[PDB]
A paper describes a structure:
Type IV IRESs form a homogenous class of viral RNAs, which completely dispense with the requirement for any IFs and thus are able to directly recruit and assemble a translating 80S ribosome by themselves. The approximately 190 nucleotide sequence folds into a compact, well-defined three-dimensional structure making use of three internal pseudoknots (PKI-III). As a result, two stem loops (SL-IV and SL-V) are exposed and are responsible for the bulk of interactions with the small ribosomal subunit. PKI is an independent domain of the type IV IRESs that mimics a tRNA anticodon stem-loop interacting with a codon.
To gain insights into the interactions that make this possible, we assembled binary CrPV-IRES/40S complexes for analysis by cryo-EM. A final subset of 54,561 particles produced a homogenous map with an overall resolution of 3.8 Å; however, as previously noted, many CrPV-IRES elements have a lower local resolution because they are more dynamic. Careful analysis of the local resolution also showed a high degree of flexibility in regions of the IRES not directly involved in interactions with the 40S, such as L1.1 and L1.2. Interestingly, the CrPV-IRES appears to have restricted the conformational flexibility of the 40S head. This is mainly accomplished by insertion of SL-IV and V of the IRES in the cleft formed between the head and the body of the 40S, as previously seen in the context of the pre-translocation binary complex CrPV-IRES/80S. With this conformation of the head, PKI is able to bind well to the decoding center, allowing for a detailed analysis of its contacts. Briefly, the conserved adenines 1753 and 1754 (1492 and 1493 in E. coli) project outwards from helix 44 (h44) to interact through A-minor motifs with the nucleotides forming base pairs (BP) 1 and 2 of the codon/anticodon minihelix. Accessory elements from other ribosomal components including G576 (G530 in E. coli), C564 (C518 in E. coli) and residues from uS12 (P64 and S66, [P48 and S50 in E. coli]) assist in monitoring the shape of BP1 and BP2, and less stringently of BP3 (the wobble position). We also observed an additional base pair between position 1 of the first translated codon and the ribosomal base C1273 (C1054 in E. coli; termed BP4, Figure 1B,D and E). In standard decoding, this ribosomal base interacts with the anticodon nucleotide of BP3, whereas here a rotation of the base about its glycosidic bond allows for a tight stacking interaction with one of the CrPV-IRES bases, redirecting C1273 towards the first base of the first coding codon of the CrPV RNA. However, in the context of the 40S subunit, partial density for the VRL can be observed.
Numbering used by the authors:
A (entry chain a): 1 to 100
B (entry chain b): 1 to 82
C (entry chain R), G (entry chain W): 2 to 130
D (entry chain V): 1 to 87
E (entry chain A): 2 to 207
F (entry chain X): 1 to 97
H (entry chain C): 39 to 255
Write the structure that this text describes.
RNA sequence: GAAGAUGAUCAGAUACCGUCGUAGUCUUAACCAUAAACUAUGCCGACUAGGGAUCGGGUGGUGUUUUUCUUAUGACCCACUCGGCACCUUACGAGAAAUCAAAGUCUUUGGGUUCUGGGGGGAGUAUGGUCGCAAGGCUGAAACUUAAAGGAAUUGACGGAA
């Protein structure tokens, strides 16, 4: 079997063997490089519920803060649902952040 | 840089750019800055990369602090070149 | 799915290339012309071709198209190209003053020519991208 | 090459590139003959008289080819100020 | 060898400057190009003008040296210079290619637009690249209008010029045409701005 | 890359040693050396051997072609070992007895 | 370490030739190297070459003619017993006719033909075809 | 039924290009096939092998036939043509055509001493294709074509009378081997000798000179 | 959370899933000496093609800002400089090809060295050595067997992949 990638787990190059991180969904030990680190910056309130909250609330403007979860996914787990998105051989080379 | 460089005589700019080693002939670009202290009227032939707390000929004035490369000339001190 | 077929389209194009004049917008006339011209065995096919031709004509009447630029069209283009709306003046003369060239540019000029009209800019390199 | 007493054997005696010397092969599909017309006083490019240059294909592929051509021209006397000796 | 007559006319130089043929190139810069004349600071390179002129002259000479005129295949994909190319073609009878090049034009002897040049001319070897490649399959010289970030692979006689574009490419084309005319043609003199105009060329208002 | 082997002008003994070492990967060579033919190989590393027909045995063939291959269980005279010899052509086994 | 300086130089030259350079810069610049260069020049494989005096070891520049094809160096300086010379030539050189096998010997650093003429062989250095 | 496309073809038809030597000199492409025939009437076309070759399909397989053809004479020209088509004869024809198009000259040199006419290669030349390196070492006289059968045949076609080979890697990939051999042959003209140190004039091409006769009216 | 209990599911399932959970996991004193200890790329050396960045040094910029007035440190900007954990094209160099700026300068075969491999299995076994508290390690066969074992990719077919 040939190399699919040059990088593979990616960040580990000239880095012996790094420390690991546990996945969110599976709790599989994944190296913090072969990791898939999506950043969930959700607002603390639900989109439609925001209005309701406003109606309820005291004060003006309000905090209306955002919850911050840097989620780590065990590759396989990510592939089941998450940002992964199985590419073509030629399309794998592209590292640019998608959409946008 | 391609095919026909004609390598004996470069433009001096190129030489300046390249490493003090990686030209035609080895030749350093460190200089004997002839420093004068504010105190006594006497000239110290201070090599620009001192590696030492450079005192004067006798008086404890402190001329140059040896930074890793070229020395910072301590306080308002005056100097000639080479 | 009333997508007029490829062959028909091709035929229409050919017709247009051949006989741009003698293809007046309206349909029956166009059909007749087609009949006179090309050896269409069918009737329906012929009709389709005529329709396509008419459509093409209509399109032309609102400006030109790709794959349809035969003779008359070229002439129309060509004339315009020859006698452009521009140029009054030269143009690209020394209309306003005597050329806002850079310092470097000026130097180059000096190196090359002897006496040229110049207006030496400051050359602000400027911060950020 | 030269059998017995002259008698030049081996035809197809090849075009050798101006820049490299490198032999231009029979199927060197990339190699090129540039023809530069001979100049005369006040306009005039003298019909049917050239400085002909051959460029090998390797050079062209590299992109060191244009520069080489320029150099050649300079050497000949078809240019001034273009190709310097030192860079 | 040379006539020592054509030393770049002052007017011509001025025109070039106006065009900003020589304020192009930017930060980006190719190791195969010593047509620069001092780097203007922060995202700029200034192009040597005399050298460019010389190159143009050489190109013109080369063109002249081709005997059969309907032969010098001019090319342009990118929109700014197509018009210029067309104009050039009109001036000096040599079937051009504005817009799409068609692959298998110089190879592939069945194609409707099967040209067979003995001298190719290009604007942007970054874009028309394909054309250059095609030419390289079948032994043709290539003239091209290099910005200092454009590749010069399978390129000869690379006229240096600003390929930000707009005025500059067109101007260059015009100059080339003029040169060609001078070297065997109607125009017998380097002087006189003459009945033509640069502004016949250039990109048009859509 | 100098490519493994020492290219020195006085590196000859080492080279020889290396070659010798390698020789023990080559199978035929190994066989020749150790006397596998002389120690095993029913025959005594010989072309032929006379042997006594202990019994006629039909052996079922490998695969693709399916048949019984009329072999003989032979006991070699010189060593005393027991082997199985195929018997060629039509019949032949009858002749052998 | 920098082993066989000469060899390195030769390699560099070869590389240059492959590239299509017109000239080479060589660092160490030995006596042997110089001799080799001279031999090459004599044969007709090399233009000018010039020894820079880095007030030190040396530093050569060689003008390549575009004539060199390979400029090889055989590794340990094998001891050649006159008859073996032929064998060596067969091994290295294309054709009985042309090319050389630069070998040092009592008389000096010379090609194979020269050595034969002399009636004097020795240890090989390199070759040129 | 002649009629040429290609300026070169037109020129040939006219009768101002005498032999293929000129073409070789100006490395002119020969996309048309008939030109070669016109030039060289002595083309012996020999089919080397034909592999059947199968793409695999939802139902069955697509049998085609990779016919290898070698073309020559005894002057010092060879062509190698490979084509894979379904009709066998057609495929063969195509291969032949390809070979003709290719047809490439060979520098035939002297074993050792000039004496007679040359019928070995000049220098030790080699080629490569996949994992086949065909190395052709020049022989002495009468010593024959010491080669793999296909290789030998190719040599014969070329007009090389005596030569040594050293075909290494997987020679039984016959087509590949042939290709390698061809490459090696080509490399003969390309290997610079001291015979060709002397500078040549650079002649004007027929395409430049006879430019009015070439091209359509 | 190997062991073990235990709750479902299936023709069954001491298997997942599920719940719990000794040994450990973690540590401290001894060993052991093995790994997909993998960049599945030995080391040293040289040379060959562009590009930007990026870390650590170090030069030059009447550059900018800091502001305690000139500042002087600091921190950038830009150019070059040497340095390790990193893209695109053509490859003429390579390579079976994926690919490779080295896996290049190799039938145009030789810069300097160490180590390893020689169809697959039998077998990392048998045996002996040796090393260990052990588990195991290093070392390491043959008999016998067999026409393929592999690699890379191509088209298919297929997939509780998208
Ligand atoms: Mg896989
Ligand atoms: Mg494996
Ligand atoms: Mg490190
Ligand atoms: Mg590690
Ligand atoms: Mg069966
Ligand atoms: Mg559990
Ligand atoms: Mg249960
Ligand atoms: Mg084995
Ligand atoms: Mg596989
Ligand atoms: Zn997971
Ligand atoms: Zn004092």
């Amino acid at each position: 079997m040939p190399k699919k990638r040059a990088s593979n787990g990616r960040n580990k190059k000239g880095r012996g063997h790094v420390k690991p991180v546990r996945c969110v969904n599976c709790s599989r030990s994944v190296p913090k490089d072969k990791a898939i680190k999506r950043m969930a910056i959700r607002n603390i309130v639900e989109a439609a519920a925001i209005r309701d909250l406003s109606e309820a609330s005291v004060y003006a403007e309000y905090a209306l803060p955002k919850t911050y979860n840097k989620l780590h996914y065990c590759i396989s787990c990510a592939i089941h649902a998450r940002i992964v998105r199985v590419r073509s051989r030629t399309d794998r080379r592209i590292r640019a952040p998608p959409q946008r | 840089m391609v095919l026909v460089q004609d390598l004996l005589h470069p433009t001096a700019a190129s030489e300046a750019r390249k490493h003090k080693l990686k030209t035609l002939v080895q030749s350093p670009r460190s200089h004997f800055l002839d420093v004068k202290c504010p105190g006594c009227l006497n000239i110290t032939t201070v090599f620009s990369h001192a590696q030492t707390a450079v005192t004067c000929e006798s008086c404890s004035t402190v001329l140059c602090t040896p930074t890793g490369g070229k020395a910072k000339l301590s306080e308002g001190t005056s100097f000639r070149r080479k | 799915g009333r997508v007029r077929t490829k062959t028909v389209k091709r035929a229409s194009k050919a017709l247009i290339e051949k006989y741009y004049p003698k293809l007046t917008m309206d349909f029956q006339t166009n059909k007749r012309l087609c009949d006179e011209i090309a050896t269409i065995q069918s009737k329906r096919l012929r009709n389709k071709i005529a329709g396509y031709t008419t459509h093409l004509m209509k399109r032309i009447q609102k400006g030109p198209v790709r794959g349809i630029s035969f003779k008359l069209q070229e002439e129309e283009r060509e004339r315009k190209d020859q006698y452009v709306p521009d140029v009054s003046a030269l143009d690209l003369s020394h209309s306003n003053d005597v050329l806002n060239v850079d310092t470097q540019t000026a130097e180059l000029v000096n190196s090359l020519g002897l006496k040229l009209p110049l207006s030496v800019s400051s050359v602000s390199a400027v911060r950020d991208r | 090459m030269e059998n017995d007493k002259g008698q030049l054997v081996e035809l197809y005696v090849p075009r050798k590139c101006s820049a490299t010397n490198r032999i231009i092969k029979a199927k060197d599909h990339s190699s090129v003959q540039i023809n530069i017309a001979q100049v005369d006083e006040e306009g005039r490019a003298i019909p049917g008289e050239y400085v002909t240059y051959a460029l090998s294909g390797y050079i062209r592929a590299r992109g060191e080819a244009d520069d080489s051509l320029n150099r050649l021209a300079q050497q000949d006397g078809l240019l001034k100020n273009v190709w310097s000796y030192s860079r | 060898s040379l006539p020592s007559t054509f030393d770049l006319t002052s007017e011509d130089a001025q025109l070039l400057l106006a065009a900003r043929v020589h304020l192009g190139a930017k930060n980006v810069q190719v190791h195969q190009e010593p047509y620069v004349y001092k780097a203007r600071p922060d995202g700029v390179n200034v192009i040597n003008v005399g050298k460019t002129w010389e190159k143009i002259v050489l190109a013109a000479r080369i063109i002249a040296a081709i005997p059969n005129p309907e032969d010098v295949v001019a090319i342009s994909s990118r929109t700014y210079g197509q018009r210029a190319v067309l104009k050039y073609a009109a001036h000096t009878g040599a079937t051009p290619i504005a817009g799409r090049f068609t692959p298998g034009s110089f190879t592939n002897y069945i194609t409707r637009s099967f040209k067979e040049p003995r001298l190719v001319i290009v604007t942007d070897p970054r874009s028309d690249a394909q054309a250059i490649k095609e030419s390289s399959y079948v032994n043709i010289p290539v003239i091209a209008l290099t910005d200092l970030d454009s590749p010069s692979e399978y390129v000869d006689v690379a006229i240096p010029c600003n390929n930000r574009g707009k005025h500059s490419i067109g101007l260059i084309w015009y100059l080339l045409a003029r040169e060609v005319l001078r070297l065997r043609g109607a125009l017998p003199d380097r002087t006189q701005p003459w009945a033509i105009m640069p502004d016949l060329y250039f990109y048009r208002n859509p | 890359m100098g490519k493994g082997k020492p290219r020195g002008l006085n590196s000859a003994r080492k080279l020889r040693v290396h070659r010798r070492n390698n020789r023990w990967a080559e199978t035929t060579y190994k066989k020749r050396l150790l006397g596998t033919a002389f120690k095993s190989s029913p025959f005594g590393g010989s072309s032929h051997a006379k042997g006594i027909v202990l019994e006629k045995i039909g052996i079922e063939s490998k695969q693709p072609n399916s048949a019984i291959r009329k072999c003989v269980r032979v006991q070699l005279i010189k060593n005393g070992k027991k082997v199985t010899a195929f018997v060629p052509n039509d019949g032949c086994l009858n002749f052998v007895d | 370490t920098r082993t066989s300086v000469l060899a390195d130089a030769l390699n560099a030259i070869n590389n240059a030739e492959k590239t299509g350079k017109r000239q080479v810069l060589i660092r160490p610049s030995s006596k042997v190297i110089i001799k080799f260069l001279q031999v090459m020049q004599k044969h007709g494989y090399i233009g000018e070459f010039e020894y820079i005096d880095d007030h030190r070891s040396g530093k050569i520049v060689v003008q390549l003619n575009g004539r060199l094809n390979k400029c090889g160096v055989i590794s340990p300086r094998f001891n050649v017993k006159i008859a073996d010379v032929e064998k060596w030539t067969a091994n290295l050189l294309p054709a009985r006719q042309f090319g050389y096998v630069i070998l040092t010997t009592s008389a000096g650093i010379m090609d194979h033909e020269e050595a034969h003429r002399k009636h004097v062989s020795g240890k090989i250095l390199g070759f040129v075809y | 039924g002649w009629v040429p496309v290609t300026k070169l073809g037109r020129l040939v038809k006219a009768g101002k290009i005498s032999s293929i030597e000129e073409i070789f000199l100006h490395s002119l492409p020969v996309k048309e096939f008939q030109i070669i025939d016109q030039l060289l009437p002595n083309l012996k076309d020999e089919v080397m092998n034909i592999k059947p070759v199968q793409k695999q399909t939802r139902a069955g397989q697509r049998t085609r036939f990779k016919a290898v053809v070698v073309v020559g004479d005894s002057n010092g020209h060879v062509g190698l043509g490979i084509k894979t088509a379904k009709e066998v004869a057609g495929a063969i024809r195509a291969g032949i055509i390809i070979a003709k198009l290719s047809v490439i000259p060979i520098r035939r040199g002297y074993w050792g001493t000039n004496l007679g006419q040359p019928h070995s290669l000049a220098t030790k030349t080699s080629g490569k294709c996949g994992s086949v390196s065909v190395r052709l070492i020049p022989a002495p006289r009468g010593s024959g074509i010491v080669a793999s059968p296909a290789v030998k045949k190719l040599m014969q076609l070329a007009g090389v009378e005596d030569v040594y080979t050293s075909s290494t890697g997987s020679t039984r990939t016959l087509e590949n081997t042939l290709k390698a051999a061809f490459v090696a042959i080509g490399n003969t003209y390309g290997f610079l000798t001291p015979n060709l140190w002397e500078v040549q004039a650079l002649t004007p091409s027929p395409m430049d000179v006879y430019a009015d006769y070439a091209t359509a009216s």
